[PDB]
Ligand binder design. Structure first.
Ligand SMILES: COc1ccc(/C=C2/C(=O)Nc3ccccc3C(=O)N2C)cc1
Ligand SMILES: COc1ccc(/C=C2/C(=O)Nc3ccccc3C(=O)N2C)cc1
Ligand SMILES: O=C(O)CCC(=O)C(=O)O
Ligand SMILES: O=C(O)CCC(=O)C(=O)O
Ligand code: NI
Ligand code: NI
Lengths: 287, 287
């Protein structure tokens, strides 16, 4: 059984139900090739200057990722395409509201460009969030997913160049005795296609076997506003924040958040008032 | 069986183990009377100007609290005593590190002064966090507490003036069929004493029966850094933040946070570096 493939345009309402059932779906043309081109051009130099994940200069080193991986997060100040087009994606917001309605508001836990160098080895089969959110392992087995990951192709994803592996149905597994690469299928994708998985989907980066190809992806971990993001937008200039839509501001934590509790008292509030009301935060003011 | 009473000075190591077992403990002299006096003087006018919890001017109204309740949160910009003495409390930090070591770093989910007017009615018996963090209800029954609440007396707590009710052992209850005021005992406290409960302890504010007395408390909900605070310090002037200790800065979300994962990749980071390193955030710079 291959990963279900759905149109971002025509199959929008089917995307979350498909992931809830199978643990994975390919969203064809999640981003237009124009958005992919602009995002690639904007992040290009930041990928080139990025040190190894566990660089000795870093006070929060990533000791997990391969030395042939470059990860660049906090994309809002880097990329106009990201903070305007991606953060306001109609498809992303329909899927996230479908997924997280039981919990309430959602925001970006991490938006990162990942670039894998030629001959990058396959990652071990894993669930996400286990190096940042221990709390997730204490959730009841059948608890609705508290985060999902859009793995957006910024270059071709082929079997040969290390396309992502997923185990379909593995998001519902309690016993992990049958976890093996034998159980996996591949996310073959054109640039702009996205693999959508949950925080419980067992998956891994594939082995780069050509020895010539550089694979790049945009990973958008969307999570309930009750969970702390892996990344901070606290240092993003206020002029950049005030250039965004109110919705994009909320996704970067520059707004108060609401739970789905019938008489919700809210998150990141200030004496009964929102961040945006208190700070008089402007929106859609061009730079 | 009455609520166990412990000295902040002499019984420090016994406090968290006592709450883990019984679901509640009284910390005698948690704050000195001097700190209580200074905090009361500093918040006094902010309590007086505070509207009803569900005021029509508020875009995050609290529809739960009685109209005879005034709640003032985001205390850092209001109170020197709070941001210096309370946020750096040796007793608070030992208890929180004892409670949350399985999860990692902790911070303030809410620090609020609550003032109850004369003849304030008893609250319904409840667990905290159910109007802000639906995720907590999806945790496995025996999951370690992800938040605890220091209910610090800023005035006398008597049976007559509505001292808090707790059900001892109720933090371990799955079946709530035996929940009744018949099962409760009272937190009788002098100013500076604190009632410590978990997010699972069944408790309620008591009925004010004198018709003359105003009861005031400082409620400090301490929670794992993986859960989003009820309140935001985003609007607190940077000069005020830079006057605090690095530890106080972390508690207000003006620092990156760490999980207890052996190879933790951190929370609120910026491309492998902390908020404080990135923003060049100064500490202990007097105003
Ligand atoms: C080589 O083996 C691995 C490498 C990574 C993971 C998983 C994570 C993670 O939990 N979260 C994310 C989410 C998006 C992108 C990257 C990461 C990441 O950095 N790590 C560490 C597991 C196994
Ligand atoms: C009248 O009945 C009530 C009133 C309050 C609660 C509980 C909460 C809550 O979950 N969190 C806190 C934590 C500290 C102080 C106040 C509150 C608060 O405002 N509410 C609503 C329950 C029942
Ligand atoms: O490289 C990939 O396709 C997946 C990367 C990943 O799953 C991860 O780093 O968590
Ligand atoms: O009034 C009290 O002592 C307790 C208040 C409380 O439990 C609450 O508001 O959540
Ligand atoms: Ni992963
Ligand atoms: Ni309460």
């Amino acid at each position: 059984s291959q990963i279900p493939r759905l149109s971002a345009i025509n199959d929008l309402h089917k995307i979350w139900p498909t992931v809830e059932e199978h643990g994975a779906a390919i969203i064809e043309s999640f981003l237009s090739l124009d958005i992919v081109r602009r995002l690639n051009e904007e992040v290009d130099p930041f990928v080139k200057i990025e040190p190894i994940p566990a660089a000795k200069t870093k006070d929060h080193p990533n000791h997990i990722l391969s030395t042939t991986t470059r990860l660049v997060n906090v994309l809002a100040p880097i990329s106009k395409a990201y903070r305007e087009d991606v953060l306001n994606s109609k498809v992303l917001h329909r899927i996230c509201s479908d997924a997280f309605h039981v919990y309430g508001d959602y925001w970006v836990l991490m938006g990162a460009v990942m670039e894998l160098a030629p001959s990058n080895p396959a990652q071990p089969l894993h669930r996400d969030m286990r190096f940042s959110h221990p709390i997730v392992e204490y959730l009841k087995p059948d608890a609705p997913a508290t985060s999902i990951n859009f793995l957006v192709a910024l270059s071709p994803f082929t079997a040969e160049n290390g396309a992502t592996h997923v185990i379909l149905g593995s998001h519902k597994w309690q016993n992990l005795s049958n976890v093996s690469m034998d159980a996996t299928v591949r996310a073959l994708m054109n640039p702009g296609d996205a693999l959508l998985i949950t925080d419980s989907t067992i998956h891994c980066g594939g082995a780069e076997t050509t020895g010539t190809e550089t694979r790049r992806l945009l990973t958008i971990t969307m999570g309930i506003s009750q969970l702390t993001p892996l990344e901070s937008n606290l240092a993003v200039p206020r002029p950049v924040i005030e250039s965004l839509t109110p919705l994009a501001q909320r996704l970067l934590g520059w707004a108060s958040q609401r739970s789905a509790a019938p008489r919700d008292i809210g998150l990141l509030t200030i004496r009964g008032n929102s961040i945006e009301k208190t700070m008089n935060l402007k929106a859609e003011q061009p730079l």
